[PDB]
Design a protein around this ligand. Structure first.
Ligand SMILES: CCCCCCCCCCCCCCCCCC(=O)OC[C@H](COP(=O)([O-])OCC(O)COP(=O)([O-])OC[C@@H](COC(=O)CCCCCCCCCCCCCCCCC)OC(=O)CCCCCCCCCCCCCCCCC)OC(=O)CCCCCCCCCCCCCCCCC
Ligand SMILES: CCCCCCCCCCCCCCCCCC(=O)OC[C@H](COP(=O)([O-])OCC(O)COP(=O)([O-])OC[C@@H](COC(=O)CCCCCCCCCCCCCCCCC)OC(=O)CCCCCCCCCCCCCCCCC)OC(=O)CCCCCCCCCCCCCCCCC
Ligand SMILES: CCCCCCCCCCCCCCCCCC(=O)OC[C@H](COP(=O)([O-])OCC(O)COP(=O)([O-])OC[C@@H](COC(=O)CCCCCCCCCCCCCCCCC)OC(=O)CCCCCCCCCCCCCCCCC)OC(=O)CCCCCCCCCCCCCCCCC
Ligand SMILES: CCCCCCCCCCCCCCCCCC(=O)OC[C@H](COP(=O)([O-])OCC[N+](C)(C)C)OC(=O)CCCCCCCCCCCCCCCCC
Ligand SMILES: CCCCCCCCCCCCCCCCCC(=O)OC[C@H](COP(=O)([O-])OCC[N+](C)(C)C)OC(=O)CCCCCCCCCCCCCCCCC
Ligand SMILES: CCCCCCCCCCCCCCCCCC(=O)OC[C@H](COP(=O)([O-])OCC[N+](C)(C)C)OC(=O)CCCCCCCCCCCCCCCCC
Ligand SMILES: CCCCCCCCCCCCCCCCCC(=O)OC[C@H](COP(=O)([O-])OCC[N+](C)(C)C)OC(=O)CCCCCCCCCCCCCCCCC
Ligand SMILES: COC1=C(OC)C(=O)C(C/C=C(/C)CC/C=C(\C)CC/C=C(\C)CC/C=C(\C)CC/C=C(\C)CC/C=C(\C)CC/C=C(/C)CCC=C(C)C)=C(C)C1=O
Ligand SMILES: CCCCCCCCCCCCCCCCCC(=O)OC[C@H](COP(=O)(O)OCCN)OC(=O)CCCCCCCCCCCCCCCCC
Lengths: 193, 247, 98, 122, 153, 251, 126, 173
């Protein structure tokens, strides 16, 4: 949508500013990216989503899809974190009240096998940890394929050496070119015919 | 293109109270054999409150329909810099007027059955017991009004049975095909396969962006080609301006 | 250089048939292995027969079970491919006739 | 000028705010549409506070109601605040509904005025 | 597409040959087949012949389905009317007419029939439509509507 | 279970199978409708002798199985070795099979006389068809050239019912109108095959120089089985049987 | 042997069906709808197929009471199921995001909202 | 596997499945001037089939709704006596069954031909669905990618140099 002369090549500027030995530099040189196909490879890549999103944002800032993905991921992180914290707080409050009244849920061994930690303490630990792990797993599963597709597009662009801003990029007002609203219609003349 | 199709997802919720009333009336009728007047006053009062609610809804809709015909607008006189209220007549498709008359008749019938129910409840309160004749008459009035409540759903019948009318005669030799029963027996199999795939095979996800504004207002570009409606240039400009404002 | 182009409708129908047939073939192979195992178990436990006879019967039972499971996709793909091959052969003969 | 269908996304609060501000302060809109939006705003502002005040009064009464008064404070306050919550939410919901309905009518008028609907013409 | 070469107007001998061909076609037209003289007469007759072939195949399949589905579905389906779901044998349950059913198993037999006969016909027609081929008279692109003149044939 | 029921109760199972199976298989293989019919006829003639011999042997065994028991008087090996009797029965079946195969497949040359052609007194039709096919069959040992492929693609809409009206547009055809008309007439109107053009043959020779150097002849014309197979025998100038035909061949 | 399977009918297809004994061998100790309807069906079949007048009339008297009891049980079932259905419907529509993004072309009549014919409608006079 | 696989209105288990609601929505965002005569004929045949199919859908849903209404009424079958309640309650149960059936997509040879065609008409329809009906196109592209169809319009395109315009649902690479 942006004409070649109206493109600011912010992606190219960031690529130039990047260091000498960089993964983006290697991709531009011609390094090809392939998503992992093994379970271990996918599990390892699961933790690289944040870095990929950050670098893609730095490269193609103001890109519609990248900006929408960032906003959605931030909102999902906030919502999942608050839900997990509320669940943990409610569970801890319930456990404390029922233990005060003398009722303890018969979950987990009463005493630890090695350190002899009490069932109440281990229940608190599980209530604190399990929801966080579930939140992380859910977010990673939700965003992994999208992040991989975005990264594949970025790597293909680097290999093709297309460092210009992609489609659906909307620059701020400072970089937006003013529109000429002065139009002078041509003088009317009777047709010779 | 003026098909006038109303959403069933919106129609069913509106229709719920009437079916609730008729079901409660049937339960009251069935239970009248072994129940007393005092105990069944609960059901009677529930039916009365539901009928009042439906009466309010019907009156509100009827008032809107009747007030349509009075076109009142504000006109700004620039010389005096003053807004003035002006009244004018209405011009619209005659189908709207016909359905408005039908809805007026429906509202009058509902007022009639509401008065019938009020009379019945007052009389049973005075007597001290309920009677099958009047109770069943009220139940059947509720059923009839429920049937009549579907008056404004005739566009779906037209949409279904006009494509049958437009079919020409077989031997006039326009297409030389008749696939009614064939399509019936083929759609049986197609629906079987579709349901089996839906509840046992891959189902595409429904996840979508819920936060970024105007994300799905996709302006034309190379990816989407330029075969859109011609005057969507303004739409594309507005989308561009909105994206600039967001960013 | 240009080359003969097949009919898109036939290509799509064959693609669907081939996908269904691959999925079947896999599931039916697993079903056949399971049926062979079950037949061997039944023969060695309730049937008084030689080991060779029991193994042959189990193999045939498993093969029959797999064929029963996979017949629908196999037959559908066979008929679709036969029709497509006939159409392609007729078109190519009509093009190259001289 | 937006996607239609069940699979589409319903209007967001930010989108509604942006659209109403556009209708209010844009130059391409007509004076009649702007007046419609302004009238919507002024005539809808009332319900938001009317419902809140009614809820406050009703909750004040229900706090001293025959059973709520004798109920303990933990139950008493929770039960007595319910009418206030219901009336407040009703007032806010009706205000938003009226304002959004009239703003959407104004948006339809603007779309027809600028010919931005693919199936509408004179 | 490309256009073919347009022949020059026919001579008198060609006109006579065309007239003779049309006369022969008219004579060949069957007496019991009522088709009006029109440009689409021959196309209509061909369509009718194909429809007649499809009708023959469909009715043969329908008869075969009536023959087959009976012992396989309808007769076993009639075993469900032996007893009610409570376990008691079948007994008459009148609607508005208290018909006298003194005859042995009259109630059970008639009740079973009322459901079996519609089921029999439905299954037979489903079998016919399933196993009957309409390929002969199916034209997806409607290319068989081209007019064929008697002299061309 | 629905598919199993369909398989069991398909009316095609009850319907008698026809002879069109070979034609359909050959068409799927690639042979034209006429070529498929000719090849199917040849194969059916080749296998009919074997089928008839097997049926004759089976019928002979059924009717006269007691001959093996009777022969035990002179050959007690049959009496005291059932395996020998079984082998003798198998040998008799194979003997009938071979007699039928000889009758229906052996050359059995005979005169080309309309008075007895087709009576099966001599296997003239089958012998001539087999000889012609084997003699004149030579697989195309080339690769279709670009010109041939382009002509095949351009032959999509050609029809002999009505000649196409060729129109010369200088902006898309080039050259001169007369030269373009001559080339079009050569390509389509004349019916000359693409491989018969001089430049096409020269390109074929240049591309297959390696085969020519090795000493292998290049077949310009692909084999046309319908140009050498004719079950009726009219192609080979075989006189049709008089009593089943109302015409005569010069010979 | 095709006749042995086509023209030979099962004894159950001709002879009158007996009583399913397993249905009554073991029963719950609750005077519920199942037992009530079992007794109703038993008495009804006996009345239909019996020549004994003394037992039928008392069976009719008991069957009227059985009908009343079954009506009460059905009333309870209808109440519970209808209330559950109504509550489920209300909850579904409360927690279901109703699509409010349907096309609104029908509600707009550009040629009618602003009369296109203008003054020509009133008389003409040209 | 019926004996009418040639029939255009017919379908296969693995053919592209589209709901009636999706088809009617897609009809809205298409222009006939931009389609070839072959594409117009395909759409006309599809409408010819849908005319009967849509009307028959409630016929298919009727028995399920009837059974559900009977169960809701109770365990008593009273014939004509209970028709009022049966059909008053079924008047809302049957719409639900029809809703489920219409939301259920069904395969069709015409659907797959129109969507997956590799010509100008196919590209035009795919792009129009992608632009003016993003919600439908998301599901359609997921289905196509799962069924091994590759087009530049698909959001799951791994060989594209431009970022997707819609969320990409999880899937196996
Ligand atoms: C990525 C990291 C994420 C971390 C998240 C935070 C939570 C986890 C870490 C927390 C650490 C600090 C916690 C506070 C400590 C306070 C002090 C204290 O007393 O401790 C409290 C308390 C222990 O005190 P205690 O009183 O002795 O209680 C003992 C009771 O038995 C305990 O009873 P219980 O009531 O706890 O119940 C048993 C326990 C379940 O514990 C089990 O016994 C389950 C064992 C499952 C094994 C599955 C197969 C493993 C195959 C090999 C894997 C190799 C590594 C692969 C790595 C891949 C890449 C990540 O929990 C449950 O059953 C309920 C939860 C359901 C399961 C969910 C578990 C999720 C774990 C996620 C983190 C995993 C980290 C692995 C690190 C590397 C290990 C090599 O600690 C915990 O409750 C935390 C336990 C953490 C897991 C321990 C696993 C031990 C077995 C390892 C086997 C493999 C290695 C063997 C090596 C042998 C020698 C060479
Ligand atoms: C109830 C107790 C149980 C006992 C009774 C059984 C159950 C009750 C129904 C029984 C009576 C049904 C009607 C008579 C059919 C047979 C007539 C006959 O023998 O004369 C030869 C006559 C012509 O045969 P043909 O020319 O050789 O065609 C066969 C070829 O294979 C070619 O096949 P094709 O696929 O091309 O179809 C050919 C047909 C195809 O024609 C069509 O396309 C018409 C159908 C279009 C689709 C349906 C549109 C209307 C419904 C719309 C529903 C909208 C719902 C609402 C939606 C929105 C709101 C929710 O077109 C023609 O050949 C031209 C003639 C068309 C006449 C159609 C009108 C027939 C009825 C009126 C005359 C007879 C009096 C009936 C009295 C009332 C009976 C209830 O038979 C036909 O009508 C065609 C064959 C029909 C199928 C076989 C029927 C076997 C009989 C048992 C059927 C059992 C029920 C299950 C099937 C459903 C009913 C069909
Ligand atoms: C399965 C397919 C079915 C298709 C569909 C059929 C549908 C039904 C349609 C049926 C229509 C009827 C067809 C009939 C065909 C008959 C054959 C045929 O066309 O031959 C015409 C035949 C043409 O044969 P050709 O001239 O040799 O030319 C060569 C052939 O074209 C061809 O020759 P070649 O190149 O093949 O072989 C050369 C040579 C190579 O072969 C030889 O050299 C063989 C030499 C020995 C003869 C064959 C073996 C004999 C074994 C001993 C006898 C049987 C033993 C077992 C039983 C016990 C017997 C005691 O063969 C010959 O010398 C042929 C001579 C003809 C006789 C032998 C033919 C086989 C006879 C088999 C008889 C048994 C089968 C049933 C009856 C016949 C069929 C109905 O024409 C004539 O010769 C007739 C000319 C007449 C001129 C005018 C005469 C005027 C009257 C003068 C005498 C008056 C006497 C008055 C007496 C009065 C006393 C008081
Ligand atoms: C006085 C008489 C008044 C009669 C009025 C009532 C007429 C009823 C006619 C029903 C026709 C239904 C056609 C549905 C076509 C749907 C097409 C489609 O794309 O599907 C998406 C449909 C429609 O969705 P939608 O309406 O949200 O679509 C949105 C798009 N626009 C805005 C264009 C409408 O999906 C659904 O929501 C499912 C609706 C199913 C409705 C089925 C009703 C069948 C009739 C039931 C009657 C029961 C009475 C009880 C007795 C029964 C026995 C007699
Ligand atoms: C809070 C706890 C303390 C105790 C609370 C005691 C309960 C008090 C219930 C009052 C009921 C009043 C009935 C009014 C009937 C007339 C309605 C009308 O005309 O509509 C105007 C207005 C509606 O005006 P509207 O035009 O804005 O309609 C809005 C329409 N929709 C919903 C689509 C947006 O009514 C309402 O707002 C709600 C009416 C509901 C009517 C339901 C009738 C049957 C059930 C009655 C309640 C039974 C409760 C029993 C106790 C249970 C305790 C757990
Ligand atoms: C602007 C809004 C509308 C304004 C118009 C006002 C409309 C007012 C309508 C009032 C309706 C009142 C109905 C009362 C019916 C009483 C029936 C009766 O006597 O009981 C018989 C009996 C009463 O039985 P019972 O149950 O009381 O006791 C019988 C005796 N035991 C119990 C001892 C065996 O009921 C029956 O037989 C059952 C059937 C009743 C059918 C009633 C039909 C009424 C038709 C009314 C038509 C009105 C036309 C109006 C035209 C326009 C006017 C403007
Ligand atoms: C160790 C403990 C033993 C306890 C005893 C009980 C053990 C029970 C063991 C059950 C094993 C089941 C194995 C199923 C294998 C399926 C294989 C397959 O794919 O076949 C598909 C076929 C159908 O194929 P299709 O082509 O229609 O479709 C298959 C499915 N799709 C479409 C997805 C490909 O089904 C069969 O025909 C299977 C059965 C074959 C015949 C053997 C049947 C034996 C049982 C008959 C019982 C009859 C009782 C009376 C019924 C009266 C009715 C009125
Ligand atoms: C895509 O798939 C397909 C289609 O689309 C779905 C098709 O339409 C078709 C079209 C063709 C068809 C033939 C239609 C096929 C339709 C089918 C299979 C569904 C219809 C099936 C039926 C109607 C059969 C229903 C019948 C039954 C299940 C039998 C029930 C039997 C019962 C209950 C037996 C009860 C008996 C007893 C308990 C015995 C009691 C005995 C006693 C003595 C009483 C007790 C007494 C004492 C004393 C104790 C095909 C082929 C297809 O494959
Ligand atoms: C393959 C290597 C492994 C070893 C096998 C080698 C096979 C060699 C080739 C086939 C050999 C066939 C002969 C086999 C041994 C002899 C069989 C026999 O007994 O045949 C004679 C028998 C006479 O009948 P009989 O029972 O004596 O009745 C007297 C009534 N008073 O009549 C019969 O029973 C008929 C025998 C027919 C033999 C075949 C003939 C060819 C055509 C067969 C058509 C299909 C027959 C299908 C039969 C199905 C039976 C269930």
């Amino acid at each position: 949508m942006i004409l070649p002369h109206n493109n600011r090549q912010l992606a190219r500027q960031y690529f130039d500013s990047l260091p000498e030995n960089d993964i983006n530099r290697k991709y531009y040189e011609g390094l090809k990216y392939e998503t992992p196909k093994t379970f271990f490879g996918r599990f390892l890549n699961q933790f690289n989503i944040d870095a990929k999103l950050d670098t893609l944002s730095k490269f193609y800032t103001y890109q519609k899809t990248i900006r929408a993905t960032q906003a959605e991921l931030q909102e999902d992180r906030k919502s999942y974190l608050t839900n997990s914290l509320l669940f943990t707080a409610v569970s801890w409050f319930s456990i404390y009240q029922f233990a005060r009244k003398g009722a303890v849920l018969p979950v987990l061994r009463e005493y630890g096998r090695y350190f002899g930690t009490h069932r109440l303490f281990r229940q608190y630990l599980h209530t604190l940890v399990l929801p966080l792990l579930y939140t992380e797993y859910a977010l990673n599963q939700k965003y992994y394929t999208h992040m991989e597709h975005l990264w594949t597009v970025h790597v293909n662009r680097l290999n093709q050496k297309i460092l210009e801003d992609p489609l659906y990029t909307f620059y701020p007002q400072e970089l937006n070119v003013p529109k000429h609203n002065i139009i002078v219609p041509t003088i009317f003349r009777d047709t010779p015919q | 293109y003026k098909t006038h199709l109303f959403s069933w997802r919106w129609f069913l919720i509106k229709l719920l109270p009437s079916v609730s009333i008729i079901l409660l009336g049937y339960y009251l009728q069935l239970t009248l054999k072994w129940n007393l007047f005092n105990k069944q006053n609960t059901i009677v009062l529930l039916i009365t409150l539901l009928l009042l609610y439906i009466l309010w809804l019907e009156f509100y809709q009827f008032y809107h329909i009747l007030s349509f015909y009075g076109n009142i607008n504000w006109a700004f006189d620039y010389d005096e810099y003053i807004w003035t209220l002006e009244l004018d007549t209405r011009r619209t498709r005659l189908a709207n007027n016909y359905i408005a008359i039908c809805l007026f008749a429906k509202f009058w019938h509902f007022v009639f059955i509401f008065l019938f129910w009020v009379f019945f409840v007052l009389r049973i309160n005075e007597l001290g017991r309920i009677r099958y004749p009047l109770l069943v008459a009220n139940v059947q009035n509720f059923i009839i009004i429920y049937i009549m409540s579907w008056a404004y759903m005739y566009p779906w019948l037209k949409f279904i049975f006009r494509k049958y009318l437009d079919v020409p005669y077989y031997w006039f030799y326009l297409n030389g095909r008749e696939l009614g029963i064939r399509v019936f027996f083929t759609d049986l199999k197609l629906f079987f396969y579709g349901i089996t795939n839906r509840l046992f095979d891959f189902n595409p996800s429904s996840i979508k962006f819920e936060k970024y504004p105007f994300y799905y207002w996709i302006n034309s570009s190379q990816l989407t080609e330029f075969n859109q409606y011609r005057k969507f240039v303004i739409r594309d400009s507005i989308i561009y301006s909105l994206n600039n404002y967001i960013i | 250089a240009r080359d003969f182009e097949y009919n898109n409708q036939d290509v799509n129908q064959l693609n669907g048939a081939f996908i269904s047939l691959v999925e079947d073939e896999k599931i039916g192979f697993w079903v056949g292995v399971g049926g062979f195992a079950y037949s061997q178990f039944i023969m060695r436990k309730f049937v008084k027969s030689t080991n060779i006879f029991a193994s042959v019967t189990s193999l045939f039972a498993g093969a029959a079970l797999a064929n029963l499971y996979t017949h629908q996709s196999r037959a559908s793909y066979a008929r679709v491919a036969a029709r497509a091959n006939r159409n392609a052969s007729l078109a190519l003969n009509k093009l190259m006739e001289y | 000028m937006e996607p239609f269908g069940t699979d589409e996304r319903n209007w967001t609060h930010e989108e509604k705010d942006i659209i109403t501000r556009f209708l209010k302060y844009d130059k391409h809109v007509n004076l009649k549409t702007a007046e419609m939006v302004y009238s919507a705003e002024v005539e809808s502002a009332y319900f938001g506070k009317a419902g809140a005040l009614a809820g406050g009064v009703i909750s004040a009464l229900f706090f001293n109601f025959p059973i709520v008064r004798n109920l303990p404070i933990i139950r008493r306050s929770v039960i007595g605040v319910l009418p206030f919550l219901y009336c407040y939410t009703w007032g806010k919901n009706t205000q938003e509904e009226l304002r959004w309905l009239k703003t959407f009518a104004a948006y339809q008028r603007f779309v027809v005025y600028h010919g931005q609907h693919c199936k509408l013409w004179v | 597409g490309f256009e073919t070469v347009v022949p020059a107007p026919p001579t008198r001998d060609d006109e006579l040959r065309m007239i003779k061909a049309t006369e022969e076609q008219f004579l060949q037209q069957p007496r019991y087949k009522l088709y009006m003289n029109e440009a689409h007469r021959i196309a209509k007759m061909n369509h009718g012949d194909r429809h007649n072939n499809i009708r023959a195949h469909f009715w043969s399949n329908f008869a075969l389905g009536l023959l087959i589905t009976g012992p396989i579905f309808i007769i076993p389906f009639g075993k469900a009317f032996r007893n009610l779901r409570s376990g008691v044998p079948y007994y008459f349950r009148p609607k508005y007419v208290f018909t006298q059913k003194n005859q042995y198993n009259q109630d059970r037999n008639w009740g079973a029939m009322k459901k079996q006969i519609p089921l029999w016909l439905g299954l037979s027609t489903a079998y016919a439509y399933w196993f009957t081929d309409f390929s002969i008279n199916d034209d997806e692109w409607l290319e068989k509507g081209k007019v064929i003149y008697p002299h061309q044939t | 279970v629905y598919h199993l029921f369909e398989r069991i109760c398909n009316p095609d199972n009850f319907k008698l199978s026809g002879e069109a199976a070979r034609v359909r298989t050959l068409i799927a293989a690639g042979f034209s409708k006429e070529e498929a019919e000719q090849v199917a006829w040849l194969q059916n003639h080749q296998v009919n002798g074997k089928i008839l011999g097997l049926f004759t042997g089976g019928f002979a065994l059924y009717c006269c199985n007691n001959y093996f028991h009777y022969f035990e008087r002179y050959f007690p090996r049959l009496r005291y070795q059932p395996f020998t009797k079984f082998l003798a029965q198998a040998a008799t079946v194979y003997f009938f099979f071979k007699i039928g195969d000889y009758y229906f497949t052996s050359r059995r040359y005979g005169s080309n006389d309309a008075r007895m052609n087709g009576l099966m007194y001599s296997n003239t039709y089958y012998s001539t068809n087999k000889e012609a096919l084997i003699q004149n069959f030579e697989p195309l040992n080339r690769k279709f050239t670009e010109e041939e492929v382009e002509q095949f693609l351009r032959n999509e809409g050609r029809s002999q019912e009505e000649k196409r009206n060729w129109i010369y547009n200088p902006h898309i055809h080039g050259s001169t109108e007369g030269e373009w008309k001559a080339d079009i007439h050569e390509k389509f109107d004349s019916g000359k095959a693409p491989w018969e053009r001089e430049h096409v043959k020269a390109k074929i020779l240049e591309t297959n120089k390696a085969k020519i150097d090795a000493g292998e002849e290049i077949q310009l014309k692909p084999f046309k089985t319908l140009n050498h197979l004719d079950k009726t025998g009219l192609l080979h100038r075989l006189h049709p049987f008089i009593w089943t035909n109302n015409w005569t061949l010069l010979g | 042997m095709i006749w042995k399977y086509l023209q030979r009918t099962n004894r159950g297809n001709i002879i009158q069906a007996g009583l399913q004994h397993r249905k009554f061998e073991n029963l719950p100790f609750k005077q519920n709808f199942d037992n009530l309807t079992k007794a109703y069906d038993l008495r009804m079949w006996y009345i239909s197929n019996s020549p004994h007048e003394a037992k039928n009339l008392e069976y009719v008297n008991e069957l009227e009471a059985l009908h009343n009891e079954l009506n009460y049980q059905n009333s309870r079932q209808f109440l519970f199921r209808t209330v559950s259905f109504l509550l489920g419907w209300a909850l579904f529509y409360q927690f279901y995001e109703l699509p409010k993004t349907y096309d609104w072309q029908d509600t707009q009549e550009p040629k009618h909202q602003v009369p296109a014919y203008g003054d020509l409608e009133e008389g003409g006079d040209e | 596997m019926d004996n009418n696989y040639h029939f255009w209105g017919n379908g296969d288990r693995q053919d592209v499945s589209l709901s009636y609601e999706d088809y009617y929505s897609i009809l809205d965002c298409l222009l006939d001037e931009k389609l070839s005569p072959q594409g117009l004929m395909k759409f006309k045949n599809l409408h010819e089939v849908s005319m009967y199919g849509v009307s028959y859908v409630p016929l298919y849903c009727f028995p399920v709704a009837y059974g559900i209404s009977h169960m809701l009424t109770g365990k008593v079958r009273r014939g004509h006596s209970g028709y009022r309640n049966l059909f008053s309650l079924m008047s809302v149960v049957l719409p639900f069954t029809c809703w489920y059936a219409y939301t259920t997509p069904i395969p069709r040879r015409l659907y797959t031909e129109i969507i997956c065609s590799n010509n100008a008409d196919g590209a035009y329809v795919r792009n129009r669905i992608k632009q003016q009906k993003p919600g439908i196109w998301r599901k359609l592209s997921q289905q196509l990618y799962n069924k091994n169809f590759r087009f530049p319009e698909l959001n799951q395109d791994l060989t594209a140099t431009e970022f997707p315009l819609d969320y990409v649902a999880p899937h196996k690479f």
